[model samples]
Structures are given as C-alpha cells and as structure tokens.
Target: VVKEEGFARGADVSWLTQMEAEGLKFYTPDENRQEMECMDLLRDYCGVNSIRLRVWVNPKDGWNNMNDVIVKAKRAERLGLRTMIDFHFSDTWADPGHQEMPEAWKELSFDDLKIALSEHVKSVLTALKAVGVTPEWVQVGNETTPGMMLPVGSVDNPEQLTALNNAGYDAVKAICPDAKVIVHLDAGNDQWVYNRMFDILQANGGKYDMIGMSLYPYWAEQEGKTGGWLKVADDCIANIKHVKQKYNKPVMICEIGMPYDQAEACKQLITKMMQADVEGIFYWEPQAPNGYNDGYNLGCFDNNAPTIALDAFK
Candidate 1:
C-alpha cells in the first residue's frame, strides 16, 4: 500500500528491456515531447510504485530467465520501486489456454516434477536474494486458471497441481520469507470459475497469500453477456468481494488492460476496483507506444506519449 489507495499501483513491464533493445522509445508530453528511458517515464510521470517481472524457465530468447529477470529487478530496485516476480514455470507463455511444460522437464515423472519445480523456484529466488533484489510479492504461476506445467499439474488433476503449487510456495517462503505469494488466474468477473478452482486448492493443501486476477474489459464482454464496461466493472467488483468473503484472502488486479481508446472506461474500472477494497492493481504492458495490434490494443501510451488512461492510477 503506497497511498490512500492502500494497494500497489503497479505495471507488468516484463518486456521493457526487450522492447527497448528493439528500438522502443518513450516520451513525456511537452512542447518538444522529450524522449527518455521507459522506466524513468513510468516512475517519474505515471506514479507507478511497483513493477511485476515475469520469469520463464529456459526461455528461447533468454529474456525472462533468472539472469534477465534479475537485471530488470535490479533496475526497479534502484528506481525505488517495489517488485513482484511472476513465475511462468515454462519456456514461454503460460495461461489458462496454454501451460506448456519446459523442455527440460518434459520427461520428468510426477515426483520428479515436484522436485524440479521446487528446485527451480528455490534457485531463482536464491539468485534474486543474492543480488539483494527480493521481490515484495511472488506469483507461483501466471493466469493458471487451467493449472500450470501440463499433464502433471493440470487443473483437471488437483492432487498434482496442489503439490506443485505448495512446492513453489515453500521455496518462496524459504528464500524470501517476507515476500507474499500469489496464485493468479484470468477473469475477474467469473466467481464460479474462481470458486471451483480455489475450492480445490483449499481442500488439497494449496497455500497462497493473495488472490490475483486479470481483468480485461473486452474479454469480459466476449466471455459473458456483461453488456459493457460498466457492467464488467460491477461484475469484477462482485467477484472480488465474493473471493474475499469466501477465502478470507486479500485480492489484487495483477493484470488489466483495456483498449487504448477506452481511457474513460478504464479510469472507471480502476475506481471500481478501489471501491471494492482490493489490495492492488497492475496494468499489463501499458508502455507500448504503438499498440501491439489493433485487435490487441491496451497500452496506455500513444505515439510515444502517455495516454489519459495512465492517469487513472492517481
């Protein structure tokens, strides 16, 4: 909690360095549109207090590996920003629809997977700790609505999933005792989905300090007859309240993104989350000056300048 908001005002900029290396640029809104490092712009202008960095196991490009993540974490630490580590437990993206096992662990048996997961977590956190860059919060997996790591840890198989989740939690506590661990999933508007998944985690000995969610207005509309952005906000708040009452755990909007054009609606969404009393809110990749694509438009920047949506944090 950094202010009256009483929660983390954060951004998941896992792609910052990679994007910068590929010639991405950021700017301040001035007569000259002064250019600067993306990080400086984020901290000095956008009022972001925390940053979320995703770690992948043996990534193809080595961008989200332990080394790469440590580099970014160090920068955020230097900038005096809180840190959140999101472990994907894969070589690439791991979400509800896809949680592919890392190549190195593809052949491991169930028991071996538990050990592999434990060691991977322990080793990564140990490295971050050695660098004096302990994250304030750690997510065991990313958007794991379907569970992470494939056959051994699929949502359909709660026994193994719970074991693997506990393994990561134990490792996190061991290396960074003060760090809060989160079990994240997508869809902040779907309480039944959360109820079914978390009910199993609770029954099967899973542990977590907070409930993490990803809220996207477009997705909410597409997933349900939520009507519009306002309805989506209402449903999201309702789901947050339901989760708190059901699990007695604090909640965080770990990832959220709306179309860049919907700045006013996006502002309302954040206001709604604050009214819901969640512990934090983090925008997902809001630094892209040029939208990822017209179809996937959600960055809070336009033509290298901050958009009105970025002010929603204030």
Candidate 2:
C-alpha cells in the first residue's frame, strides 16, 4: 500500500516559537515571498499534517520548557495538525552524543529518578489535557542512540534504562491512554543501531508501543557508510520493515532531513519512505534557516522560507 490515509506527514518545528522570538520570519514558497507564521507556512504551503514539539524538564531561559511546549501544542491543536510530544528528559538537548540529566533530576536516587521522570511526564500531559490538547504520540526520549539520562541509561545500564523507559510508559498510559508511546533513537538506516538497542530493550522487557527512528542520509555518509543519501534512505526503508517484523511493533521515521540545497533529492528521499509501510515521517526543524544553529544546514528552508524539500510531505 502507498500514501495511506493516516500516514503522518510532519515537521519538527519545536524551534518555531524560539525562532519567532528571535525575530526570524517565514514566508510562503510563492514568488511574492509573502511573510507568514512558520506554522501556517508549514501547513498551508508545505502540506505538513502534523507537528512534533520537544519538551525539556526544566530548561533555563524557558526555551523548550513545558510552558513553551504548551504554547506550540495549543497552536497545533488549533491548526488541526496532529501533535507529537518528544521528551528529552534532560533540561537541554538529548541525543546520541549527550543525554545530560536535568538539573532537578541530577541527584535523585535510581528509585526516585523513576518517580521524577513519571512526574515530569504527567505534569506536561496534565497541563495539555487541561487545555484540551491530546497528543497523538508521546516519545519517551529523543534520539537516544547511546541511551537517555546519561551514566545510568547508557548501554552498560540496559536494565536500568529499560526500567526508566517503563516509568514513562506507565505515566503516558495513566493520563492519555490513546497516545502511542515511542522509543526514539538516531540512525534509522543502520540496522545494527536499531537491532542493538531494541535487543537490549527487549531482553530487559522495555515497554513501548512504537519504534521511532531518526533517518539522516548525511549522517550515513559521514559515518563511513557506502552509497549516497538516496541509497541511505533506501536502507532505512529496508530497516523499517525489518524492525517492524522483528519487534512486531509499528514504526515511524520520527525525524528525517538532508542538505538545504538538495530539495529535489530530499523530496524524492521522503517520497520513497512515505510509500513504505510505516506510520509517518517528520522533517527535523525544517523551518530553521540555513546556518542558524551550529551551522546546521540539514533544515529544508532557505532564508526564512521553506524550500521545495518539504513538498514531500504533501
């Protein structure tokens, strides 16, 4: 089957509010360059059907903190876009390289750490519930390629990591039973990356409903893999089916991106994956301008407007 009715076509615009606060403006893809809200631009012009927002436990300067997340999530609900909440668990970015513990959770004992995690999840969900916004998806951790929560949730602590992950599972189920919980990790194309982590989680009885992955052709090329980005995405498609069958859990490409200059190629890359039997795909921070953060050029926008790369969502 192809282009399934519910196949989520999404964008990770967690930076939308921050970008606006920083005076970053977005425009439609039309020749007139008419200025528009980034969220509106994504929905109207890029055909984005869903939004992914990341939530931090207690961030400084209030960026991506719970309050900021509610603002964005409420906007998404109003726009009729399905909402997906990604919890970094940390106060800042959590990824393959670093999963720094939040300031409040840094000193808690293991048993207490679980309590803090569950409490945090409930707090965020409960706030959204009060606002009448129910997320369709809840990611326990973000790009936890190495693992989340640092020292305790790393590869060496598979049992502990699984236990912590279960804490999130219980919290989400307690509040929003309809929301599917995702266990997200980076490197979607590499089978071993998923295999290794899932194996650990499986052995330790990790509880999660969906298998979320980050697919990046650029990273594949940089990590000593052969073939171009296209081939890399192809491998990701293969792995998607592999993991779905292996784990018997529905899968989704939680994050996908490519160089800003290669919109056509990126579109085709996304198109191919959309035809696969996965739940959805999200372009990570596609509204971000070129060279905005850390010289990060993977975003699908030029200047303040979205490039053709995002047309793949439609």
Candidate 3:
C-alpha cells in the first residue's frame, strides 16, 4: 500500500477580494492585533496551508469571474499556499438552494449545454494553467447535492446531472491531469444523502476523482433535530467512513463551520473532524466576519480578528 497524502489545512477565502475591496481589515491575534492582509493572516495565524477560490462564469460585478479567480489564485501562489478551485458554473452561487444557469447558456439544448459546461470549465482552468498556478484540487460543482445548472441539471434527472458532472470532470482532467476533481455535496452528516447521490451517479456513469462534503452542525440542527453539535459531528464522521468505503473514493471535507460565537465548540468539532480519514478540511470563508453583510454567520471572525476556532488548523 502507498502512503497517504498529507492532510490539507485550508479555508475558502473566495470573498477575500470583495471583503478587502470593501476595506475590511484583518488582524493577527498573536501580534496583539497587528494588521495583516486576510490571506496572510489566515496562513500565518491559523496554519492555513491552502485556500479555496470560487469561479463564476460571468459575474456583472466582476467579483468572482475568471480574472478574479486568477488574482486570488496567483496571490496564493505568491504566499506558497496550495489552491482549490471551485467552479460554481453559474453567474452567481451554485449551492443546493441556488444553481441558476448562467444567463448566456440558457438558450442551449441539453446536447449543446454539455458543450457549454465543458467550455466554461476549460476556459477558467486553461487560464490558470497559463498563469503557472495549477490547482491541487478542482471542485466541479459546489454543494451539488440537489443538482447543478437548474431544471435541466437537477439531480431529479440523474442522467442529465451525471452528464453535466462528467463533462466538467473530463474538462478538468484534460486541463490539469494531476488535479483531483471533487464532486462536492451538502449534508455530509446524513448517510442517506450520500448513499442516494453516489448510487445514482454510479448507476449513470458519473466520473469524479474525489468526494467533497460540507459539514455545518448549526445548519444541520436547523434543518433536522440533529441532536447537539457533538452528535452532528459524530454522524458526519460516521458518514465519512461509510461513504468513502462504499464509493471507493477518498473524501475531502470541502466546507465546514459552526456558529462564530461558539469558537471553542467549533474548534472541538473541527478537531473531531480531523480524526477522520479524509484528504482535507476547509473552513468556508473563515475570514468573513460574524453576521457578515450577506447574512452569513458561520464564518470564524469577530471584529477583524480570527477567533480561537481556527486554532484547530494549527
């Protein structure tokens, strides 16, 4: 048997550019709140060895489009940090609740839609390739449990969804052969969610290099009793064991977080999560402030400083 890859310590700072543009500052707790850029702060203080950056097809604000991704990914390279590129394949977010098709591709047929998907995947990847920054992991979709690209790419139609996933998968390989392409899903604590999704993909010829999951105890509790946060974490770890074996793929905890106030609890949850046999665990936007402007509070920052929760990474 071969030795396993080193576990990656990462955070999704996809909003760093926007957050910085808005003039938000970051501080290093170790240095008595000395100023630092967000990425540098994450790396230096939290032991974040890698970062995840999101790519949008054509954002009007130009915040998360191809060029925006290059800016951040290049910055990661400068700081000697590895990179994970998430292709939302939309003009906006592409989570389970929001996978709207890009406006430009709405008129295409299913046949042509696959072409569009492949092209979009290649375009950004190719841009990165030209920039001398090869992503270590590439997420073909984000929180794609329900589906991708909307009514057509929805998981309700397994065949179409698999086709779209595979298209993105194939393009990633062609561009970055060594990169691990992740098929990320939501609600990792629910074994049924993973079992149902992977079985359908297997039945329909889905192709992927790794499995990615999002673990949010707070959200899980909100949706279903899920007990307390500890129970939620236990279920998540158990599900990781079950699905990784069943699907014959290594797993990555692509996105994870707890309420910002519960820093110690969040740290405990992440420590337990680290015990699982997975490739990596990435805090989603840990640089984002608690009660973020966009109504997201799962981030791990307060008053411009990272909370103790990120010590789990160190």
Clashing pairs in 2: none
Candidate 2's C-alpha runs over 4 A off are: 1-5, 219-225
Which residue pairs show collisions in model 1? none
TM-score each candidate.
0.94, 0.95, 0.95
Question: Which lDDT tens digits does candidate 2 get at residues 1-314?
Answer: 01124879998899888888899888888889999988778888998888899999888879899999999998988888888999999998898998988988888999999999999999999999999889999999999888889889887899999999999999999999999999998888789989988999999989999999888887655676677676778888899889989999999889998988888888888888889878999999997778887888889988778888877776
Give each model's clash number.
0, 0, 0
* Candidate 3 residue-wise lDDT, 1-314, digit = tens: 11124898889998999988898898997658898998888888998888899889989899989999999998888888889999998998888889988999999999899999899889988999899888999999899888898888887999999999999999999999999999999988889878877898999999998999999887645667647767878888999899878988999999998888889989988888998979989999998887677688988988789999999988
Encode model 1's per-residue lDDT on 239-269: one tens digit a residue: 9989999999989889988877777777667
TM-score of 2: 0.95
lDDT of each: 0.84, 0.88, 0.88
Model 2 residue 194 CA deviation (Å) reads 1.2
TM-score of 1: 0.94
> Against the correct fold, how does model 3 do in TM-score?
0.95
RMSD versus native structure for model 1:
2.3
